[PDB]
């Protein structure tokens, strides 16, 4: 999908290192996890590593823009149930009626909102750390038809 | 001081908003606090606000680069005692002998390290939140002769 044709929102979901999980701070080597999307069925996530937090975020954004997927959305929800599995993360995603909300943990909620989903039920069945939730939610999204 | 003549390191000290103090995350309006410096007596800090964390950090960096000060350092420490006061923050800074370390809380340690100080004793006498520690440490640094 060509990123440059899309107006993409960029969220920072996790930032690691100093007292390990900072979500954004200072001193020695850092990695950021970023999810970007256009609220209209196009999301991507990326990872970046550098000695400074701003560079690691800039690199995570360039990476996400290269890993953009397109997701089918019907109304405000997804066309059918799906189970994402990536590494230690595994998440069940189900259609919900207009009015439910994105019932999901924050890293997963980031991915769902930037894809443009507004009502969905999700059940985490594995690691709840950000990298695992994000990569498994992604995996689920890629399976929709 | 002209920023473009200096190789400046950029640290992110605080990021605010969603469940208020994120230090770096996702959803609605964000402010970042950034300290930049060259480890050779030039530090500046800045603040940025935007709906996305990367823009608020980019803006905090442009602001810090406009607010660069120059600090006298003798060896690895500061020439004399000083008390910074800005708002609810107040911090005492004292010379320490080679071998002490930057004995300071993290937001203050960020400012001292990027200025290039390596041994100093500091005693916080006020608000310990990042914006207060940073702006008061700054104030102290500006008083050195």
Q: Which of A70, A91, A121 is the last residue of a domain?
A: A70
Same domain, B56 and B41: yes
Measure the CA–CA gap between B117 and B131, rounded to whole angstroms: 20
Measure the CA–CA gap between B106 and B111, rounded to whole angstroms: 9
Same domain, B136 and B76: yes
Which DSSP string corresponds to B94-142? EE--TT--EES-HHHHHHHHHHT--SEEEEE-S--SHHHHHHHHHHHHH
Measure the CA–CA gap between B40 and A37, rounded to whole angstroms: 40
Which DSSP string corresponds to A100-111? --EES-HHHHHH
Report resolution in angstroms. 2.8
Task: Give the total number of structural domains in chain A.
Answer: 2
Chain A: closest CA distance from residue B141 (Å): 20
CA distance readout (Å), A127 to A33, A106, A114, B22? 16, 13, 21, 21
Mutation target vs A (from B7, B8, B12, B112; most A CBs, 10 A cutoff): B12
Q: Which of B44, B70, B96 is the last residue of a domain?
A: B70
Contact A23 B27 (CB under 8 A): no
Domain carrying residue A94? 71-145
CATH number at A141 reads 3.30.230.10
Residue B11: which of B111, B136, B122 has the closest Cα? B111
Residue B137 φ/ψ, nearest 5 degrees: -60, -50
Residue A113: which of A73, A79, A81, A145 has the closest Cα? A73
Same domain, A25 and A46: yes
Contacts of A20 (CB under 8 A, 6+ apart): none
Nearest Cβ partner for A22 among B23, B32, B57: B23
The experimental method behind these coordinates is X-ray
Contacts of B56 in chain A (CB under 8 A): none
Is residue A143 within 8 Å of residue A72, measured between CB atoms? no
Same domain, B137 and B79: yes
Residue B107 C-beta-side C-alpha neighbours within 13 Å? 24
Same domain, A61 and A97: no
Measure the CA–CA gap between A96 and B39, rounded to whole angstroms: 54
Same domain, B53 and B1: yes
CATH number at B43 reads 3.30.160.20
Q: Which of A70, A105, A128 is the last residue of a domain?
A: A70
Beta bridge partners of A89: A86
Same domain, A5 and A64: yes
Q: DSSP H helical segments within A8-145, as ranges?
A: 53-64, 106-115, 130-143
Same domain, B33 and B94: no
Q: How far is CA A80 from the centre of its chain?
A: 19
Contact A12 B54 (CB under 8 A): yes
CA distance readout (Å), A47 to A10, A68, B45? 13, 13, 27
Measure the CA–CA gap between A62 and A42, rounded to whole angstroms: 15
Nearest Cβ partner for B57 among A11, A27, A54: A54
Same domain, B41 and B92: no
Contact B25 A11 (CB under 8 A): yes
Which DSSP string corresponds to B19-83? SSB-SS--SS-EEEEEEEE-SSSEEEEEEEEESSHHHHHHHHHHHHTTS-EE---BTTB-SS-EE
Same domain, B43 and B2: yes
Same domain, B98 and B59: no
Same domain, B76 and B117: yes
Q: Edge to edge, what strands does the sheet with A42-50 contain?
A: A9-16, A30-37, A42-50, A69-70
Contacts of B45 (CB under 8 A, 6+ apart): B13, B33, B34, B35, B36, B64, B67, B111, B134, B135, B138
CA distance readout (Å), B83 to B13, B56, B69, B78, B96? 21, 30, 17, 13, 15
Contacts of B24 in chain A (CB under 8 A): 12, 15, 22-25, 32, 53
Nearest Cβ partner for B24 among A15, A35, A106: A15
């Amino acid at each position: 999908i060509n990123p440059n044709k899309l107006e993409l929102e960029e969220r920072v979901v996790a930032v690691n290192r100093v007292a390990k999980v900072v979500k954004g701070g200072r001193r020695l080597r850092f990695s950021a996890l970023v999810v970007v999307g256009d609220k209209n069925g196009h999301v991507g996530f990326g990872t970046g590593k550098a000695q400074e937090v701003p560079e690691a975020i800039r690199k995570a954004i360039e990476d996400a823009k290269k890993n953009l997927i397109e997701v089918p959305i019907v109304g405000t929800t997804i066309p059918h149930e799906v189970i994402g599995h990536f590494g230690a993360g595994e998440i069940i995603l189900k259609p919900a009626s207009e009015g439910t909300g994105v019932i999901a943990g924050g890293p997963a909620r980031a991915v769902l909102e930037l894809a443009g989903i507004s009502d969905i039920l999700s059940k985490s069945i594995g690691s709840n750390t950000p990298i695992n939730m994000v990569r498994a939610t992604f995996d689920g999204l890629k399976q929709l038809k």
